[PDB]
Amino acid sequence: GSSGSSGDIRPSKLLTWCQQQTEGYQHVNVTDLTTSWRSGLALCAIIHRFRPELINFDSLNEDDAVENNQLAFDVAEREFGIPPVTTGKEMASAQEPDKLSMVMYLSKFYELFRGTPLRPV
């Protein structure tokens, strides 16, 4: 949103969490909170992580971005009831989405998952 923000980032902390959850996966390099979730795999990874019976990354093919997105969205709207801000198609179509609209969305997954405090593994 800012014209030229530099120095301190808002989602700075948010990113970490995500990058951590996705950490380990294959062909999944999360560096930002915009394009890193343009294919869907990013999110799907976080979900499947806890409940693999819901999402099967194995089937999620990069090319099948649109589907890879719709899946997570629906699943989240069926289990968590969280409505998707963008459409799978648009998610993949749009080259550079609004980091804002993204953060506001991802956040839901951050708080929804981040519950009671527990010593670091």
From Swiss-Prot:
Segment of the intact protein contained: 516 to 629 of 1957
Similarity section: Belongs to the Mical family.
Location in or out of the cell: Nucleus; Cytoplasm
The name this protein goes by in its record: [F-actin]-monooxygenase MICAL2
Domain observations: The C-terminal RAB-binding domain (RBD) (1796-1945), also described as bivalent Mical/EHBP Rab binding (bMERB) domain, mediates binding to predominantly RAB8A, RAB10, RAB13 and RAB15 (in their GTP-bound forms).
Record's function text: Methionine monooxygenase that promotes depolymerization of F-actin by mediating oxidation of residues 'Met-44' and 'Met-47' on actin to form methionine-sulfoxide, resulting in actin filament disassembly and preventing repolymerization. Regulates the disassembly of branched actin networks also by oxidizing ARP3B-containing ARP2/3 complexes leading to ARP3B dissociation from the network.
Quaternary structure note: Interacts with PLXNA4. Interacts with RAB1B. Interacts with MAPK1/ERK2. Interacts with RAB35, RAB8A, RAB10, RAB13 and RAB15 (in their GTP-bound forms); binding to RAB35 is of low affinity compared to other Rab proteins; at least in case of RAB8A may bind 2 molecules of RAB8A simultaneously through a high and a low affinity binding site, respectively. May interact with MAPK1/ERK2. Interacts with CORO1C; this interaction recruits MICAL2 to the actin filaments.
Protein's organism: Homo sapiens
Record domain Calponin-homology (CH): where: 8-111
